[PDB]
Ligand binder design. Structure first.
Ligand SMILES: CC(C)CCC[C@@H](C)[C@H]1CC[C@H]2[C@@H]3CC=C4C[C@@H](O)CC[C@]4(C)[C@H]3CC[C@]12C
Ligand SMILES: CC(C)CCC[C@@H](C)[C@H]1CC[C@H]2[C@@H]3CC=C4C[C@@H](O)CC[C@]4(C)[C@H]3CC[C@]12C
Ligand SMILES: *[C@@H]1O[C@H](CO)[C@@H](O)[C@H](O)[C@H]1NC(C)=O
Ligand SMILES: [Ca+2]
Length: 1251
């Protein structure tokens, strides 16, 4: 029967699996056992769909004898299917076994070759990202433990409305409180508050066990809701030290973790590109452009040659080609394109009559001219040369749709279809002549040439989303139905809704709000109930990983291809054209300031925001008189030395700010109020008087010059999508407070609202016709709504508000249109993913081609320079072999090999014992673990005082690791000493022993040490983000921070501008992108400000501030990331198979034990074991040392030394030159003169090394 396994069976089975997938798509879940007829038919169909697979699996086993992989997966799903069918038929378990129906499409996808190839590539790229998966696992442990020690159950009190126990009556957001003698949020006015409260968010988010605090740390690492946890641990424990946790976790675990991932991925992509460029795949596209380029001019030359004549086109063709390409024709077609985009853009909601008439009349008035232009350009270049151009076909489709829309104009449907927008791609005609437009054509060229691979990757990602949506609706289908009044729309009811929810979780936005619903639906916080968070965690991790692997591989590969194609094709432009002649022609003062200016900056930072009269703003009110005169005196001393450069103008302006703001008088409500803000230019004075700062600033400005093209393209697409969305949601996003009214006229007066859906507590509210927070009435409003969508903040609300829109000036209808989610999906895919990852890839490839473009073409490729420099900087190390007999014994006991395993397990059980402190622990449990902790302290002390007598009291302090362990130990015994009696601080050191255990491992140490040395190598890139934070903190503090701390808005006791640290925290929260739009709304003008300050408070500057800050912060962080990545790029792409510094390090570590001191004196017989202990890659394998290896080692000319006086550098260089780059005899002087040409100075230290 192994003859029907041919094509028909394969395609038949693929069709069966596809039909099974669609059957699962339809299935739809119902709350609590309900079902319609479709579910009563699909359960019948999924018996034939099981018999087919059973028949398939029955023949293969007795035909092929299960170990093929995907065959095994098919077998598991089949056997689970039969077991499920038997159980369902015999029981009248359903949840358990209908889940394998999502494993079924996996077996589907493992039938297509070029999807299996893509998955293999993804899995091969996943392998290097395992150390940076271990370090992310050993941070959510070290910080979970710390959270266990600090916030164990401290967040269980809440206001209770003293007058009876009742049930937590305190606003519609129960928040922790304190006992006054405590340090949290007092309920103040009455309302005494007592323990016995589930938790801040139903008990799912709290530091109680090692499970609820190994999820709270994960949420604060994915940055989606870390401020909400910070506030909950803030107003429950105090506001003094809860930030050193929640900011040191995100500047160590969410940026220095997202940095390594990007670096490794970029390195792997570059390495793969270099490995794939050798086959010559770039040549085919390289030869494709010229073959296409040299066709149009060949054809039109042939075309116009026929027109010159040897039937009466003596006035047609002459004014056909020389009139559509006659300059003015173009430059006026551009004018008409601008007219069309103005016509379509100049529309809003509730337009005037004249605008509606004119923008409707001009449509066809321009369409007729452009349709004529079609033909006028058609018979000029003919049909072949017209249709060959890809961009010509774009305008072809645009005009076709324009003359086509007068059929569906009868019943709107597409409305005035947003096709008139898409014509502004012909406004890039003006862009045509702009700098590097012949890379934008190359951009789309590459993105369309690699379209097959792009589509395969996108299809694999889409299949992943589909599978995790089917499983999502199987798990949480019809279970998000609680008695709570609201009807949360992030459910898993249908397939479109499940897809939208999965897409929302995949982009991170509110991924922790669906997780809480999933946990509360499957029981609650418990052992079996709180296990469904695994679904969301795996979804997030895998989705983000695949998003990176798709949208960054596409960007990096295609953009590097385009850049290389440009730099290799426009290069020959000169060598071909310019040869037109070839045929024919043939510090004290600087300190004295850098101190004063920065101290003035910190003086202007620590002011009093909210108060206009105080002592801090009087000490710092009259502080600036020493500064202002000495700052002005610098100009006076320097002015007469000359008679003007650039930064001196900035100096003049920053000093004239004080020179004028001292006086002004008169109108003391303005002008002083802008020069008060204009004092944020004092720090910028230091940019000129400090070298290196100019270097980094100029680098950033040249980066602006490089990425202006991408920025302009992104903003043009923003304008385009805003224009399409205007004709789609123009005024349809209105709603009333009462859902029973759907008209502004009807939505008036009062109506009854019931508290918490209780019919016995009616409260009168007014009726208000309120527009959405982010509407689409005009182009400008859509430009902000789409920006907020692209920031992945608040976009689900916009999606589920626009879904309910049906008609203009009418109320919403539940799920009126679900196909409108495609607009947001396409916008997120194209702008929020493609055009941002293309930005990042452009920066990465630009920084990678710069630098190493130094062209160190003194031969000596990029391994031997490092090998030679390491050979030069080398010496035998120190071993410290102890004397005095018994000291050698103690050192041997310490320096044993299997005692290290004992020392590692004594830490492994220490962390496990420490990480069991739950809440409400049995009294005996605490003391039982306390004595165990004391025993661990005793045993570790024993180890330290055993190492002291072994390594001598000197070497115990040399290695930082032993010093670090000593510091940890001595801070552990005195904790036991104070246990007889601050305390919270001293319980913490054991996590440092844990992080040492983390540090164990060669790969972890190499990666981390290299990245830290790279970060230290560039300290002038962090003093750009620091400057930005300083300037915007001061600006926002002076402008927007005077408002009252109203707990009902997004400005409260924790989020405000009323102090510099709090302003910095607010800017940090906006930088991480938590609620920046909400803070911008809260900074809108008309908010009542503090009564202590003498509703006019607020400003309209909020939009500019909170948009410019976000964009600039993103740019600066990306610049820092790319700088630190490209400083270590040499390590990132190394091909460890070839010789590397690690081999030399291990060679040195083996060699050092044979020399009591550094010296350089060796023995002659140690070579016998040296040739055996060298690694087979570095040296020789398992061959006998007394062989050709020794023969060639002695054959070469060693330096003229004694039997054993050869130095370490000489033999190391001999080994490295025999391993790689072998040369014939007589080339020793060639190496001698080469090492003095490009290599660094030897300082005449190779006198003996010459021979
Ligand atoms: C999605 C891929 C990994 C395949 C599906 C595997 C998962 C989703 C399936 C396979 C085994 C299933 C479990 C098996 C048994 C039961 C016991 C029942 O009283 C509650 C559901 C529960 C606990 C199932 C939940 C879903 C489950 C964990
Ligand atoms: C996401 C896929 C790929 C891998 C992870 C499998 C997930 C879906 C599985 C693994 C463990 C499973 C849980 C194990 C135990 C229980 C308790 C039971 O009373 C209800 C089902 C529930 C809550 C299961 C739900 C499904 C579950 C969370
Ligand atoms: C300010 O707070 C008071 C008391 O909590 C509240 O009544 C009022 O509505 C708040 N105003 C704003 C604008 O938040
Ligand atoms: Ca968010």
């Amino acid at each position: 029967i192994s003859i029907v396994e041919w094509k028909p069976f394969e395609i038949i089975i693929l069709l069966t699996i596809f039909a099974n997938c669609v059957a699962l798509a339809i299935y739809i879940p119902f709350p609590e056992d309900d079902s319609n007829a479709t579910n009563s038919n699909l359960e019948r169909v999924e018996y034939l769909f099981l018999i087919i697979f059973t028949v398939e699996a029955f023949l293969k086993v007795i035909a092929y004898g299960l170990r093929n992989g995907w065959n095994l997966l098919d077998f598991i799903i089949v056997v689970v299917g039969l077991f499920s069918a038997i159980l369902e038929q015999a029981t009248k378990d359903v949840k358990a076994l209908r889940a394998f129906r999502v494993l079924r499409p996996l077996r589907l996808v493992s039938g297509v070759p070029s999807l299996q190839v893509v998955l293999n590539s993804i899995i091969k790229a996943m392998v290097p990202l395992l150390h940076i998966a271990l370090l992310v696992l050993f941070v959510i442990i070290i910080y979970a433990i710390i959270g266990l020690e600090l916030f164990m159950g401290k967040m269980h009190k809440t206001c209770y409305n003293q007058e009876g126990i009742a049930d937590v009556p305190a606003e519609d957001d129960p928040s922790p409180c304190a006992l006054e003698t405590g340090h949290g949020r007092q309920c103040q006015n009455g309302t005494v508050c007592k323990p016995g409260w589930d938790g801040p968010k139903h008990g799912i988010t709290n530091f109680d066990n090692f499970a609820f605090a190994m999820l709270t740390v994960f949420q604060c690492i994915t940055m989606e809701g870390w401020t909400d946890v910070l506030y909950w641990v803030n107003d429950a424990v105090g506001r003094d030290w809860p930030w050193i946790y929640f900011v040191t976790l995100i500047i160590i675990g969410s940026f220095f973790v997202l940095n390594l991932v990007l670096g490794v991925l970029s390195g792997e992509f570059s390495k793969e590109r270099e490995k794939a460029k050798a086959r010559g795949d770039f040549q085919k596209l390289r030869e494709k452009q010229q073959l296409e380029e040299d066709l149009k001019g060949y054809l039109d030359w042939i075309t116009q040659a026929e027109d010159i004549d040897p039937r009466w086109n003596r006035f047609c063709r002459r004014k056909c080609r020389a009139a559509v390409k006659s300059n003015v024709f173009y430059w006026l077609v551009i004018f008409l394109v601008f007219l069309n985009t103005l016509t379509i853009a100049s529309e809003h909601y509730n337009q005037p009559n004249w605008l509606t008439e004119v923008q409707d009349t001009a449509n066809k008035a321009l369409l007729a001219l452009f349709t004529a232009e079609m033909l006028l350009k058609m018979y000029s270049l003919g049909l072949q040369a017209y249709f060959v151009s890809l961009f010509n076909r774009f305008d072809c489709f645009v005009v076709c749709g324009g003359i086509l829309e007068t059929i569906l104009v009868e019943t709107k449907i597409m409305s005035p279809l947003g096709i008139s927008v898409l014509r502004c791609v012909r406004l890039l005609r003006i862009f045509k002549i702009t700098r590097y437009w012949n890379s934008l054509s190359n951009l789309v060229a590459s993105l369309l040439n690699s379209v097959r691979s792009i589509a395969s990757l996108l299809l694999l990602l889409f299949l992943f989303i589909i599978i995790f949506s089917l499983l999502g609706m199987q798990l949480f289908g019809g279970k998000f139905n609680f008695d709570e009044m609201q009807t949360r729309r992030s459910t898993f009811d249908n397939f479109p809704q499940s897809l939208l929810t999965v897409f929302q979780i995949l982009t991170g936005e509110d991924w922790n709000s669906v997780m809480y619903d999933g946990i509360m639906a499957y029981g609650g916080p418990s052992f079996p109930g709180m296990l469904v968070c695994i679904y969301f965690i795996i979804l997030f991790i895998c989705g983000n990983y695949i998003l990176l692997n798709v949208f960054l591989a596409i960007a990096v590969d295609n953009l590097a291809d385009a850049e290389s194609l440009t730099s290799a094709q426009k290069e020959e432009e000169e060598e071909k054209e310019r040869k037109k002649l070839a045929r024919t022609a043939s510090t004290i003062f600087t300190n004295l300031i850098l101190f004063f200016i920065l101290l003035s900056s910190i003086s202007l930072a620590a002011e009093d925001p909210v108060q206009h009269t105080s002592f801090r703003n009087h000490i710092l009110g009259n502080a600036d008189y020493v500064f202002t005169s000495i700052f002005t005196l610098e100009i006076i001393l320097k002015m007469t030395a000359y008679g003007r450069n650039y930064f001196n103008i900035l100096d003049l302006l920053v000093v004239s700010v004080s020179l004028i703001s001292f006086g002004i008088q008169s109108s003391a409500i303005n002008v002083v109020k802008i020069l008060r803000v204009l004092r944020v230019l004092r720090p910028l004075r230091a940019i000129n008087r400090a070298k290196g700062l100019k270097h980094v600033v100029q680098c950033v400005f040249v980066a602006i010059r490089t990425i202006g093209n991408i920025v302009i393209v992104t903003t043009l697409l923003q304008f385009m999508f805003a224009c399409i969305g205007v004709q789609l949601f123009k005024g349809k996003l209105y709603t009333c407070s009462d859902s029973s009214k759907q008209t502004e006229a009807e939505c008036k007066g009062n109506y009854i609202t019931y508290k918490d859906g209780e019919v016995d507590h009616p409260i009168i509210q007014p009726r208000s016709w309120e527009n959405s927070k982010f509407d689409f009435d005009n182009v400008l409003a859509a430009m902000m709504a789409l920006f907020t969508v692209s920031t992945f903040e608040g976009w689900p609300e916009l999606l589920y508000r626009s879904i309910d829109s049906h008609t203009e000036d009418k109320g919403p209808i539940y799920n009126y249109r679900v196909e409108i989610s495609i607009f947001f999906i396409i916008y997120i895919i194209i702008i929020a993913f493609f055009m941002m990852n293309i930005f990042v890839g452009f920066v990465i490839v630009t920084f990678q081609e710069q630098g190493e473009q130094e062209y160190k073409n003194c031969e000596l490729d990029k391994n031997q320079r490092q090998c030679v420099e390491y050979a030069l900087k080398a010496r035998p190390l120190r071993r410290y072999i102890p004397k005095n007999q018994h000291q050698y014994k103690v050192w041997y006991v310490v320096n044993s090999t299997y005692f290290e395993y004992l020392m590692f397990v004594l830490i492994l059980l220490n962390t496990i014992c420490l990480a069991m402190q739950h809440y409400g622990q049995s009294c005996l449990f605490k003391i039982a673990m306390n004595i165990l902790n004391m025993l661990f302290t005793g045993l570790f002390t024993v180890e330290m005082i055993l190492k002291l007598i072994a390594f001598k009291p000197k070497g115990y302090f040399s290695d930082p690791w032993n010093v670090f362990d000593f510091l940890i130990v001595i801070g552990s015994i005195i904790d036991v000493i104070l246990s007889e009696t601050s305390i919270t601080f001293f319980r913490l050191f054991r996590v440092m022993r844990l992080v040492k255990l983390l540090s164990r491992g060669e790969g972890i140490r190499t990666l981390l040490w290299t990245f830290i040395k790279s970060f230290q190598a560039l300290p002038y890139v962090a003093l750009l983000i620091v400057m930005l934070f300083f300037i915007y903190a001061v600006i926002g503090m002076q402008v927007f921070g005077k408002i009252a701390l109203n707990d009902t808005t997004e400005i409260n006791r924790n989020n405000n501008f009323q102090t510099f640290p709090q302003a910095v925290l607010l800017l940090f929260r906006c930088a991480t992108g938590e609620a920046w739009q909400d803070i911008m709304l809260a900074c809108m003008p008309g908010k009542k400000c503090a009564p202590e300050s003498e509703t006019p408070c607020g400003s309209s500057f909020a939009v500019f501030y909170f948009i410019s800050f976000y964009m600039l912060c993103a740019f600066l962080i990306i610049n820092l990331f790319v700088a630190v990545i490209m400083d270590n790029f040499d390590y990132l792409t190394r091909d460890w198979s070839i010789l590397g510094p690690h081999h030399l390090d291990e060679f040195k570590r083996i060699w050092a034990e044979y020399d009591p001191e550094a010296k350089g004196r060796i023995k002659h017989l140690d070579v016998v074991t040296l040739l055996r202990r060298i690694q087979p890659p570095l040296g020789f394998g398992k061959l006998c040392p007394h062989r050709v290896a020794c023969k060639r080692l002695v054959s070469m000319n060693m330096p003229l030394n004694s039997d054993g006086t050869v130095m370490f550098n000489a033999t190391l260089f001999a080994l490295v030159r025999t391993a790689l780059r072998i040369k014939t005899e007589g080339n020793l002087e060639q190496a001698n003169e080469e090492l003095r040409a490009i290599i660094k100075k030897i300082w005449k230290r190779t006198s003996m090394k010459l021979l």
